[model samples]
Structures are given as structure tokens and as C-alpha cells.
Target: CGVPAIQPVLIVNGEEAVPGSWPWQVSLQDKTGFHFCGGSLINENWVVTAAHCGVTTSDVVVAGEFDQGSSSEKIQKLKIAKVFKNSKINNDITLLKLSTAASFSQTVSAVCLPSASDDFAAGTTCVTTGWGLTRYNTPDRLQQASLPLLSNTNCKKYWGTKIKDAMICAGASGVSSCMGDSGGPLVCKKNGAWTLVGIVSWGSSTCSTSTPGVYARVTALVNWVQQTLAAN
Candidate 1:
């Protein structure tokens, strides 16, 4: 599920992405064109996002999006037909069923999903992309950031007992996933393809080092994602 037509050159809290580099990255917007969250295109007809982004059939999914302030011929906007969410907040994942299947191109492709048991070693580098609030909080841009996975023994050094098995953590000084970045993909390159490893879940409001960005551990819930997609 993870191959992109063009290999990704990644960051969101880090810098402006090379337009169209992240082919599976999408902007999740409202009917009136407000960009709220980010998502990963998992297939032609399905997207994976954080459940906290909320469930609504009217929201628009724009694939092949780079800049929110300008137009792009590559952008493909589809109405959401339905949503499938976990029963609890801790699960923090949702699938968006597109009203119409997306057509793949150099600017549009799907990200691969990891196996249910696949887990990357700590210190593996990954990239996150989003049109999220910046330290400037001024202009519109889809930022990209490089983040490192927390050591397996230390994913909870900051949060302590609050960290759960369903969540993964990444942190870097002066870099983070902040407001409006929810539901985005945190992908790591492995086996020569990018794998969807995490879904933007939660983090500190200050985007502080004291609390690293937490993402829904996709490896733990991929079975649910796969089975639900198959059933529907």
C-alpha cells in the first residue's frame, strides 16, 4: 500500500515540503475550504486519519495537495462517503471511505501499511507532513519535519504511565506536530518503500519537549484497518 509515484523528500514542523513529493499525503478540509487535519491515502477508496479529526460525511479529502493558499491541477477533492472509527478515544484511528475512488498519477498514490506486528526499532528516522500551525502561525504552507522514534524503553520517559501500547512517540527540539496537524501520517522508509507507521494522535499544546508528539501505533491496529476495509 505504500509506494508513491515519486519518492518522498520529507518534514511539517521542519520545513516546506517539495511539492508533490509526498504523493499519499492529503489535506482534510471542511465544506467551505478550511484545512483542518491531514491524512494518508491508503488506497484508491480509503484514507487513514486520526479519529479525533472527527467523523463527518461532508468533509472533503484533497489528494495531491501541496499549498493550501494556491490552486493546483494535481489536487483531487472527494467527498467522504462514510467513516469507521474505533469505539474508544485511545484507539485514535479512523478510515474515510471516499464517495469516488481516486485516480493515481505522479502526484497521487497510496502509502503502504505495515503488517500488524511490524515495529521499527527506536531511532529509525521518519517524516511527517501537514498544513499545521507553525511557530510563526502566520502563512499557509504544508510543513514537513524529520523526527526520530523514541527508544522502545523510553517512549514513556516523558509521559510515564500515561503512554500506552496503542501509541508511539517522536520528539525533537524546536520541531513537532502542532495544531491542525491531527490525523496526518507518520511514515518510515523500510524495505525500500515508505510504510505508514503512525497516525497523528496527541501532543502537548505548547509542542514542548516535555511531551513528545504521540501517534496512534498503526502496527497495533492495522488488522482492524485491513479487516474493516475488506468487510466494507
Candidate 2:
């Protein structure tokens, strides 16, 4: 919850993100040490990701990670104590309970969650970060893309009727989330604060601009998150 004074840089196109810029961004890794998905730190001991990412207690969560090949003092690897997911449609979100609480620092902090009444209008710009694949290949360092929010109606028009109320879609021509980005955060800057608005769910097959990337609407799951955290 200790957000720093450092602000993220904005560029015209997707590029490599600065290390420690996104303290909430995390790498969801398999037992084999492969990063298969991305996640976000919503609290000191809870991480929100995608249910479709196929995470298990055996998997590890690398928080404050930047370069995959290298190590940094800011990075901390934690085991998953438990996992919580929804069974309903378009409810692709999941919350991971960390084995131990995370230490807040300049390179490690939780992102703010949107209030129940908070909403982002169409045309709002949001940023997504992950250790996912690019057009050529997946990079060791974190990659980021700036996308604009699209109306649910417009998103459904492209993604079909499956784009339900629990999902938020954002993207533009030539930019979107891809493989390994699943379970990542789609964050927006609202009222001078960066808020976690969505969790990366699904996207176009080819990761192309023809369609918008779909995300689990975080605002819709605030009650569930609070309940789960309290119960756990």
C-alpha cells in the first residue's frame, strides 16, 4: 500500500518497462521456473490473477521481478498458500493467498483497487504490463502496452456475445496482450491514482489488432475479494 513517488513513463508505442516502475506486477511461474502468466499484488498477502492461467499451489509467484534471467534484491519469491476462483461465466479472475506477507518498499507495493462505484469511461487510456510474448518472442524484461478502453457494446461486437458484464475490453490497432500475459492487470490512472481495473483474461488468437483484449472486470469482484481475504 506504500505507493512511491516515481511515475511511469508514457511512449507512443509498447516498449520495455522501467524496472521497479510497476511494483504490483508479478510473474506467475510454473514449478519448472517458467513464467506462464502474469499477476498483480492487490494486498500484502493477496494477488489477483486469471483463473484460466491454471495456477496451483505448486507454482511460485515472483514479486517485484523485472528481468527473468537476473536477480535483484527487490525481488521476492513466495509460495501460494491457497487459490480462489469463480465458477460462473466470464468470471476468469482468481485470488492467490501468499504463504507469507510481502514487505512494502520502493520496488514492491500493492496497487489500489477500484471502489464499487468507480468506473472508467470508454476512450480512457489504461496500461498493461507483463513478461509476455511480443511479435517476435517473449522478452526477459517486462513489456508494457498502452491501450484505450472500449465500450462493452463495441467490445461485444468484436468478441461476440461472450463479452459479458464481468469482462472489460481494451485495446487498439496493432497493440494487445498475448500469451504469458494472462492473469496480468489492466490498470488505469484515475484521480491521480493508479487503480487495478481488470485482470487479463483472453485475447485474439494471433494477438493482433483486429480484436480487443478481454479482461476480468475487477470492480465487479470487489465484494468477492473482500470476503475471500477475510475468510482466509
Candidate 3:
């Protein structure tokens, strides 16, 4: 199976994620070493994140980072060469072009993306990872949560018409993405392969409320991602 086995001991109701377990997870930081958002490594030179994260070429992408306070050989910091954002539909998705290619290893790898024809049904179990705030405060290490996908119809009842087709809804009463988690990957296992399905976009202000969190649907933006990668 392409997807790594889940470590049972590491489970803490999705509060703690095993180090190097999500090789595609990246920390988007500023020049002063301040992490503001998360990202996913789609390829050696390209990373995907939320456009709303306000990432610029001036920022850096730190790949294979498990802890911001810890130093390790797995950490590879790369400069951003360009940022590609879509001009339509609020365009919450963005692709970052790295100044140099990232070195792949057991602790650093690219995640597989869903194909144009791929789709997952509602209630599909998925996982989201980031160094975001946990229970209102930021954690030193990366945090993770398992959430079930909610159907658009069900989501619309909460988010109303604000929900777009390009976006997805996931989360539950006590599971959700929070501050500092924006742009992180929302991956789901399908056919034994873990596929990048969503990008953390927004959530309720109360943090882990029952309301479903919004994510930029990756499958809906596959065309833009591929075209941007090709053009750049």
C-alpha cells in the first residue's frame, strides 16, 4: 500500500501526529522563522497551499519539519520563486514554485494528487495535519485530526450559500482545523493510496465547533495545479 500504516500508539484523539508520518506536510514561514501557515509538497519544486494564507515569494517553505523548535537533517528550507493564484471564484488555492528542488527522503516526500475523474463520497474518513493551534493554543509539534467528509447538502445547511463547488466541508463536534492550519493538506485514503484531497481554508471562530470546516477541494482544482506547474 502506498499509504503508510497508522501508528496506534501515536493516536491521541488526533491531537498528536507521528513524526515524519506525513512526509508531504510543509511549514510556511516568514523570514524571521515565524510559521504562519501549512502546505503540501506536490513535487520537488512545487508546493500547494491556500491562497488566503497570503504567502508571498519572500517567504520560505520548510519541508519535513516535525517541530519548529527542533533541528534535524530532515528539515530542508527552500526559498519561494513564484506564487500562482487563480483569478476566479474567490480563488482560495495557490501553487508555490520553490527556488530549488527539495531533497526527498523517508522524512520528505510528495503526496499523490487525485485525478480529474476522481471523487470521494461524503462521510469518507480523512486526515488533516499542520502545526496549527490545538484547543486554542499553538503546539510545538505538528497536530493532526481525523474528520469525516460532509456532503454539500449537509454543509450548506450550516455555511449557507457561501459554500462553493470548489470547496469541501469536513469536521465534527470536536474535530476541526484552526488558526495556523490554513493551507495544510487534507488527505484521504482511496484504493489503498493516500491522496491529497483538500486544503484547509476556513473554519468557525470557536475553533473546534460542530460546524464543518471549509477546505479547498483539490480534485476541483487539479486542472489549475497541473497547468501552473507546466507553465512555470
Candidate 4:
């Protein structure tokens, strides 16, 4: 579900993203509309994020937005009707059903799900997009980073036995997903289109390069995402 109506030229060590460049990236906000975590708008009716966000249906979902402080035409503030989370401890992914479907546009669209057999190799380059803190500094604009995917074995070296099959890891020097960036998208370009490979889950509290951030592997949870969508 990684297709966007258009791709934005756009990262933790990340420069500012052009407004509305990331069509599927969303800002999951609070009742007062303050942003908390980042999310991916998978389709008009649903957004995928990390279960750890602990978002409720009453929370606001702002799509097609860039500057959180600006009133932009591309912005769509939405409501959630449901939330589906993986019950497994390490599977931190979750989905939110929109109260109203998001109309696709150059600034608002969906991302593709990866093929079942797809598993990005250890050296594959990937990007993590979010509005998380950079070096503990909060940003008003969205941020992204180009981090290489890491194998579980190598990841284990950083996180030890906590690394699980359902989890994927990515990070590098001066690049990382940080606080306020949880529940965002970790995508990789495949066949000229970006594919959502992971949902921002967790990292060390410091959010440094040495500790690669871990995500709920999308390939491991797509079946749950797809089946749950159809059932509803």
C-alpha cells in the first residue's frame, strides 16, 4: 500500500521536507490538535501507526500537512472510528479506521503494503519520516532520515535478545527516529515507488545513532492489517 499520487523530493540529520511532499505521512494529534506521534495514511479510511502511541478513536488525525502551525489547503484534519493493534508484545503496529475517508490528492494519499515475501536485505537503504525531536530539539516541520536496514543478528548486537522476528531495525550515524516520531513510517524505494517497510516503534531513550530504532515489521503484520480492514 505504498503508492502515492506523487512523490515529494525530501531526514534525523534530516533537512526540512517540502510542504505536502509526503502525501501519506500524517500527524496523529491530541484533542487540542497538538501533535504527539506520526502515522502513515494507508488508505482513505485507515492510518497505520505504532501500538505504543496508545491512540484512541477520539484522537485527531491530520493528513496532508507539513507546517503544524500553518493553516494550509492541503491539510485534512480527521477523526478515528476504530483502532486495531497487534496483541503480540513485540508487534507494535496498529491501525486506525477513519470516521471519514481521506480524499486522495497530490498532498493526501495512500502508501502500498509490501508483498508477503518481501524482506528488505540488511544493506538496503530506507527512510524514516516523522516530526520527532532532533537531538532532543522539537521541530515544527516534518523530518526524515535515510537509514540502512539492519539484519536481526546485527540488530541483536545493539538490543540483545529483545530483537524479535516481528521487528525490523534501521539507523546510522547522526540519523535516527526520536521522541514524538513514534508511529510513523519507515519506507524504502522499490521499483521506483516507496514501500512502507516498517512502523516506527522504539529506540533507546537517547535517540542516538549507536542504538538503531526498531519498528514493527510490516511484512509480518500485513495479513492482520488486510484481513482486519476487510472484516470491517
Clashing pairs in 2: none
Best by TM-score: 4
Clashing pairs for predicted structure model 1, backbone only: 1-111, 1-112, 2-111, 2-112, 11-143, 11-144, 11-145, 12-143, 12-144, 12-145
lDDT of 2 by residue, 63-118 (tens): 87889988754689989999888766449988899999988777788888888678
The local distance difference test score of model 4 is: 0.84
lDDT of model number 2: 0.84
The better candidate by TM-score, 1 or 4, is 4
- Stretches of candidate 3 exceeding 4 Å from the true structure: 1-13
- Collision count for each candidate, in order: 10, 0, 0, 9
Q: Sorted on TM-score, highest at the top, how do the candidates line up?
A: 4, 2, 1, 3
Per-residue CA lDDT of model 3 for 86-175, tens digit only, reads 777375898999999998887788888898678788999888888877776677788888888988889999989998998899887467
Evaluate residue 15 in candidate 3 and report its C-alpha lDDT on the 0 to 100 scale.
73
Return the candidate ranking by lDDT, descending.
4, 2, 3, 1
Q: In model 4, how large is the Cα lDDT of residue 135?
A: 74
lDDT of model 4 at residue 144? 72
Q: What is the TM-score of each candidate against the true structure?
A: 0.93, 0.94, 0.93, 0.95
Off by over 4 Å in 4: 1-6
- Candidate 4 TM-score, C-alpha based: 0.95
- The deviation in Å at residue 151 for candidate 4 is 0.4
